[PDB]
């Protein structure tokens, strides 16, 4: 890389120190520039074309400083699916925002439906215990609850299914057009 004797010695240290490669690359650059200046300076020493010490000072100044610089949002699977598909539909931003609010209301509906199905299950557990007990008054009361709670739960079931069909069909239509 360098003709110069003592610049070859200095250049090895920077490899050993693993300095910043860009600064390391620039360190080669100015040393390759300096070696031309250094040989030029000495070329005057055999040519006797300097006696004022300029061509020594100018080069050692840079070298000495070089010694310093280098040391040298949804919850239900169905609404998530509908939102994911509706993202790729031909919806206007206004229709997209209205559709977002519609999925929020649909999500509230499905949460209500699953809450009442779980209530229909714990009322079924109470009904199983009562039927095993066999008390006619307990059976009559638990029926008055259960047989009407079933219809309330099922009416929500129909309404959630219809809303899901409408939303899914509208998204599928808005994906092809």
């Amino acid at each position: 890389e360098f003709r110069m004797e003592k610049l070859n010695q200095l250049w090895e240290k920077a490899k050993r120190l693993h300095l910043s490669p860009v600064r390391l690359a620039e360190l080669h650059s100015d040393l390759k520039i300096q070696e031309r200046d250094e040989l030029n300076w000495k070329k005057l020493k055999v040519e006797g074309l300097d006696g004022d010490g300029e061509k020594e000072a100018k080069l050692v100044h840079n070298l000495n400083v070089i010694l310093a610089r280098y040391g040298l949002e949804f919850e239900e699977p169905r609404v998530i699916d509908l939102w994911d598909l509706a993202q790729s539909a031909n919806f206007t931003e206004k229709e997209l925002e209205s559709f977002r609010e519609e999925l929020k209301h649909f999500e509230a509906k499905i949460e209500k439906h699953n809450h009442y199905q779980k209530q229909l299950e714990i009322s079924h557990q109470k009904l199983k215990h009562v039927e095993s007990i066999g008390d006619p008054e307990h059976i009559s009361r638990n029926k008055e609850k259960y047989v009407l709670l079933e219809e309330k739960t099922k009416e929500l079931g129909y309404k959630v299914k219809k809303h899901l069909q409408d939303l899914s069909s509208r998204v599928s239509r808005a994906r092809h057009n």
Partner: protein, 70 residues
């Protein structure tokens, strides 16, 4: 930008987006007309077309005015 297309009935311009389907330029139409060729000059906001039924080449602005024979 919009999608310029030509047919026998008319020359029309529709948005590239499939949501907002309404035309964005006045549909060019003639009585015996049969349109084939189209191009545009967006600096003057004009469209060139050829009525193959008349054998005439026209130019017309986007807003529907300024029909002239080329």
């Amino acid at each position: 930008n919009f999608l310029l297309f030509s047919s026998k009935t008319a020359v029309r311009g529709i948005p590239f987006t499939l949501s907002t389907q309404e035309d964005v330029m006045v549909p060019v139409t003639g009585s015996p007309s049969f349109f084939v060729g189209i191009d545009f000059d967006a600096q003057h906001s004009t469209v060139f077309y050829s009525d193959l039924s008349k054998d005439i080449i026209y130019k017309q602005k986007i807003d529907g005015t300024g029909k002239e024979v080329i």
